[PDB]
Amino acid sequence: CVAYSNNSIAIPTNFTISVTTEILPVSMTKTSVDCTMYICGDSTECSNLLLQYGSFCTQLNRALTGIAVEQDKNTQEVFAQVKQIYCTPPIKDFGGFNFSQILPDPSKPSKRSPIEDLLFNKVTLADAGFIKQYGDCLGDIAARDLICAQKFNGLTVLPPLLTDEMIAQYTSALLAGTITSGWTFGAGPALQIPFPMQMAYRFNGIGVTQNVLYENQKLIANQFNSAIGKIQDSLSSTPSALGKLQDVVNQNAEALNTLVKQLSSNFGAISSVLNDILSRLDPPEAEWQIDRLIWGRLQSLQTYVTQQLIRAAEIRASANLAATKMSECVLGQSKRVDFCGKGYHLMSFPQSAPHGVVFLHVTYVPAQEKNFTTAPAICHDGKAHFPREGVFVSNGTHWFVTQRNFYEPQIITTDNTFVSGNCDVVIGIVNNTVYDP
Amino acid sequence: CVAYSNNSIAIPTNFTISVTTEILPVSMTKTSVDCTMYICGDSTECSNLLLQYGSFCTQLNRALTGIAVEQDKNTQEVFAQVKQIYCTPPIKDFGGFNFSQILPDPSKPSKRSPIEDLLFNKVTLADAGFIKQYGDCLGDIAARDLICAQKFNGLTVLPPLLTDEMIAQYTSALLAGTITSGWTFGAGPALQIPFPMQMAYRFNGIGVTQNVLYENQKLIANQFNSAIGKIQDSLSSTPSALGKLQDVVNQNAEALNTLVKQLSSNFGAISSVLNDILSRLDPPEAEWQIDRLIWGRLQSLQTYVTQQLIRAAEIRASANLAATKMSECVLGQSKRVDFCGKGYHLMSFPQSAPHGVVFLHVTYVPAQEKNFTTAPAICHDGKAHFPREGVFVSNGTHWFVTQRNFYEPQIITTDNTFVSGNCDVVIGIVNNTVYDP
Amino acid sequence: CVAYSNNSIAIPTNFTISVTTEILPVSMTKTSVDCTMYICGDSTECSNLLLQYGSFCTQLNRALTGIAVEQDKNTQEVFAQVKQIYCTPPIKDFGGFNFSQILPDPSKPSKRSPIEDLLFNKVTLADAGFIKQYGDCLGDIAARDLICAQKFNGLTVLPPLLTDEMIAQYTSALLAGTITSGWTFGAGPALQIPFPMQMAYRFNGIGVTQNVLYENQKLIANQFNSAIGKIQDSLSSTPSALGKLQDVVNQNAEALNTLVKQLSSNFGAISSVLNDILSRLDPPEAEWQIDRLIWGRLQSLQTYVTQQLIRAAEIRASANLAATKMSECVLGQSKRVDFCGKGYHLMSFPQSAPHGVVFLHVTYVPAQEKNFTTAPAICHDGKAHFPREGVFVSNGTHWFVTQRNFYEPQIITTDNTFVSGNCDVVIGIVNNTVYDP
Ligand SMILES: *[C@@H]1O[C@H](CO)[C@@H](O)[C@H](O)[C@H]1NC(C)=O
Ligand SMILES: *[C@@H]1O[C@H](CO)[C@@H](O)[C@H](O)[C@H]1NC(C)=O
Ligand SMILES: *[C@@H]1O[C@H](CO)[C@@H](O)[C@H](O)[C@H]1NC(C)=O
Ligand SMILES: *[C@@H]1O[C@H](CO)[C@@H](O)[C@H](O)[C@H]1NC(C)=O
Ligand SMILES: *[C@@H]1O[C@H](CO)[C@@H](O)[C@H](O)[C@H]1NC(C)=O
Ligand SMILES: *[C@@H]1O[C@H](CO)[C@@H](O)[C@H](O)[C@H]1NC(C)=O
Ligand SMILES: *[C@@H]1O[C@H](CO)[C@@H](O)[C@H](O)[C@H]1NC(C)=O
Ligand SMILES: *[C@@H]1O[C@H](CO)[C@@H](O)[C@H](O)[C@H]1NC(C)=O
Ligand SMILES: *[C@@H]1O[C@H](CO)[C@@H](O)[C@H](O)[C@H]1NC(C)=O
């Protein structure tokens, strides 16, 4: 097992690039319900009475409308952060990085990346759900909105303001900018920079010198390409990968099913049918039975609305988090641990998903650690010398200085150290020569 | 359109300082409702019966009380982060920066900044709203609280614990500290520092050397002053700028209006008036009709309470975000992209607003980009040299090194580069002389 | 009072390490309620009727189940971030830091730290609460779940998936890793490093050179040890320190008490007892009275469920914040102001608490500030020199350069300054000699 030591340090001699996907729901289907059609359907005697209950219907209808509008804002706040659409890079001559699975391709009319085309297939809408049956009733015609609503007990699904194609186009712009302009494309003009240099400068942000990339550019490129390939298989095989997006769809479907099914409930009355009770009873007695169904059908709808408001808040938080991660992880480089995947964040790539966003985080994780003896300071000519950058390490009989995240032994010289103190205060100082550079 | 290139880099030759306002709601009006006065008003027969319904009234009353207390905490958590009130700086001899529109002035008794005096005028309370009518009924007297509540169907608005003047005083302290003590005033004692130096050190935090400020101090000062002037006009002209704060006020007003209006509803009864039904009917029949209004007037109030709880959660999240932004953007310098406005964050200034906070974010955005040929490394004497800071750029026949966010060509010397490798591994290395400093 | 000055700077000559605790609720008791036992208990006539009300019971039961599952996820997302359990460090020979109050000890079978053993005692469950009475009814037996539920009006508390011991074991692993492997244990392999070096490198992250730790290691160690001792007394004495955790427990207890007490309510009927009304009335009249209690007992339970959903969202946000702070504050070093305690964040230590987490944040706050005259640049041989790091300060007749967060006057030399401009542009430049290093 791991054991502490007062004079031993472990420094990584190698590295492995990894890509970790994170899926967050961003929006919900713009479902809506009419309160004067769910309770009373075609009946004129049930409406007159429902007016005496005041604003109850108007309150629930307005609440659902707010949720629908919130879904449009949620999507805009995430994907619309950049609207200076960057043109796709036609030069397929990067330094080995094969974005072919990340960027779109022309071999299909959907203009979606191979990963996006898989995500859009893993999430599906069942034929038993009213969300699909309502669409078949319209047939893209808008005039039959009220006709289909009357058939589906007043259920109405509004069309999203931004189509799936618009979201894909916005995501492509973010990708092209990051690949061609780095993190600065989101903080100003399209300051183009070569991608190998961009990675070299991102390495310096995680304490790794630019040298490591250039001397390992082919190896680093191969690692990135393999990681992007493996994630596609992982999502394809694992059926419960996009559960976060499927769960929100399933939850909304169950809510509508329970709401519509409750119309078949008597709530303590002679029947669930308003024409049957109104024909069996006389007027001075039917209104007692037609008041029990109205009150049961109002609490049912109120339960649906209140549950949707709670669910909408969860999606709103996820959408805000997604927008924050797009800015920090995609448009920049987040130093915050675990915010842009495991390991040190280098860069991330966004991918569109149905009612959600998938972030591909590229991170640097050290590997192949090796033990080395270390000392806090070096003593020379009575002066105590400290490392300006990196750590002092001992290769048996010799002492060297090296980067903390990559083993690179260098001779201890005045150019990489600084001096302070009379060598009598630093506990554990070791005597070693410092050469003049 | 923008095009990628493997050997071209764009570096900005100039900069434009910009100020972007962000408005967040922090609190809500401390509205409260009594459940034994909304349903039954002055009637003793309606109360006896309302007791049989158990704790329903106590649950709703306690819920509203919690919301009111939460509003006080929300404001305290945002503005009370610093309470060592810093004295206003009477020396109007900064390095050109004209905070006169940001700081208070003595020409008015409100002691609010010119921007604050505009924000407090763009948000207004209508005379038709009960929030104002309740205040006119009290006339600052506290003894008539119960008398005015009985008139307004039990509606009662509690006074905020912190007055608008207290919030302004707290904001002034934060401003004076930031202007006179920088980001350290919030992490320890009032370590005073000259403002030009403070900006010079904030520039170094965004990759821009201190030199750029000193050689452009007058230009930078003029840019800041113009930006602070333009924002005042923007808020004055644009009527939908403070909508986030007006929307929460409007939403609460509509909720009370719908609640009070529902008292005029029969909920399926002989009349909405309890004395009328109780006088027309005998006792063994009036209780059937006085049970239908109690149940309608309880779900109405329950709908108001539940909707307020959902709205209070949204304000709580905004208040927490505002407190986080005050610490990160005002008391410090946030590296997180888009968290403290567009562009690289330099500093921000807080301004008080009715039930909200307005953050003025000052950011650095590069401008006037110019294309330059770049190489990843320099080859000299067979050794490959890499840039210690900045990027190598070619001015036609000559190669230079320059900062990434400001064009400053310097001769390539050992003092600004480091060496590694035998010049046979770096792809794209170029041969150029490195001079001895 | 503090006063601004254009040529004076304050630099701290000393420092005081401080430890500030932050308590956040992470989970809630897995309470659950059966909807066909709260309303109708043992009665077969009340169930037949309750079926006509449709899915109402199934909706409320499913909602409570989701909350219970959410509590398990909340705890896992916070504590399970690391599962490579690090072995306790048996070498009690650190550089003076006495973690004995932070780490567990073997003198007790609970295997909890002295601070953890106090936190687990300050929060208690009253004997009048059903949460305890339900446990006494089971006696650790699982077969009597349904029997005890029938006695407690259908109330059922589920056992947590992770026991208190498992949470303590996970917290110990995080502590051992941080003490023996620093922030890298959470971003890769267990890269061991000596603790004094780890603190020396964390100091460099707050602008303080490693020198300050080594020359003050004994003083810094003593300060840390004293701070850890004082916090234990603070929590022991202050009774309202863990209120955030006690409040959530109290709120849930009151909710169940109000729910169960409402069974004693007539809701406008002949009695709250179903056998009494069903025996006094004939069948064609008892169903009118047995429909009024069902509807009152359904809105009561619905009010409990909706309030719990609102409360569960608050805990979910706190749990997410706790997980974020564990990653940023414990597994790393957060530059974000006020996110990991007052002052500059050095490191933090986690401690388990009942249904919550306590973070011990160790921060650096400067002290003993001293005024010094400063200049933005130095003029020599007509060239304007700027400080590469730190600030220029004047000790009366002599000019020196020093770190911004620690007074360390050094001679101005080319090794600690850089040159730019012709000395005619920098406003406030002072003439002083720069020596050749
Ligand atoms: C580092 O790891 C990679 C894994 O792809 C391996 O190919 C390589 O040989 C290892 N060593 C070095 C020095 O790169
Ligand atoms: C990128 O990967 C795909 C995988 O199918 C491959 O077809 C393509 O040739 C690769 N690109 C290059 C330049 O080899
Ligand atoms: C490093 O240690 C090995 C093992 O003792 C030795 O063979 C080698 O020469 C050492 N390195 C140098 C530069 O002497
Ligand atoms: C940079 O932009 C400012 C805009 O105010 C302009 O005055 C100035 O001439 C431009 N060029 C330089 C070198 O500052
Ligand atoms: C600051 O701006 C205001 C704008 O009205 C102006 O009156 C004032 O003179 C300015 N300050 C200075 C020092 O010029
Ligand atoms: C930079 O390029 C221009 C255009 O060729 C040239 O006139 C100028 O002399 C170059 N700079 C230097 C320092 O030679
Ligand atoms: C700094 O503060 C500590 C407080 O513990 C004190 O012991 C010490 O004498 C002070 N001065 C120095 C130079 O450390
Ligand atoms: C650590 O503190 C405890 C406090 O009771 C003390 O008993 C123990 O001796 C201390 N450790 C050392 C090494 O002195
Ligand atoms: C610093 O100032 C004091 C007071 O004038 C003086 O005694 C001392 O000699 C100065 N330091 C140096 C290095 O001259």
Author numbering:
A (entry chain B), B (entry chain A), C (entry chain C): 704 to 1140
Which lines from the publication concern this structure?
The spike is composed of two subunits, S1 and S2. The former initiates viral entry by engaging host cell receptors, and the latter mediates fusion between viral and host membranes upon cleavage at the S1/S2 furin site, shedding of S1, further proteolytic cleavage at the S2’ site, and refolding from a prefusion to postfusion conformation. S2, in contrast, is the most evolutionarily conserved region of the spike and can elicit broadly neutralizing and protective antibodies. Although immunogenically appealing, prefusion S2 is metastable as it irreversibly transitions to a stable, postfusion conformation when S1 is removed.
HexaPro-SS-Δstalk is an S2-only construct derived from the prefusion-stabilized SARS-CoV-2 HexaPro spike. However, the apex of the resulting construct (HexaPro stabilized stem without the stalk), termed ‘HexaPro-SS-Δstalk’, was shown to splay apart, adopting semi-open and open conformations. On the other hand, for HexaPro-SS-2W, we successfully generated a high-resolution (2.8 Å) cryo-EM map from 1622 exposures collected on a 200 kV Glacios. The cryo-EM map of the HexaPro-SS-2W was processed with C3 symmetry and DeepEMhancer63 sharpening. 2D classes, especially the top-down views, indicate that the closed prefusion conformation is predominant in HexaPro-SS-2W. The structure highlights key residue interactions also observed in the WE simulation, showing a densely packed cluster of hydrophobic residues at the S2 trimer’s apex. In this region, an extended network of π–π interactions encompassing W991, W998, Y756, F759, and F970 surrounds an ordered salt bridge (D994–R995). T998W shows clear cryo-EM density of the sidechain, filling the cavity in between the CHs of the S2 trimer. By stabilizing the S2 trimer’s apex with V991W and T998W, we were also able to resolve the fusion peptide proximal region (FPPR, residues 835–857).
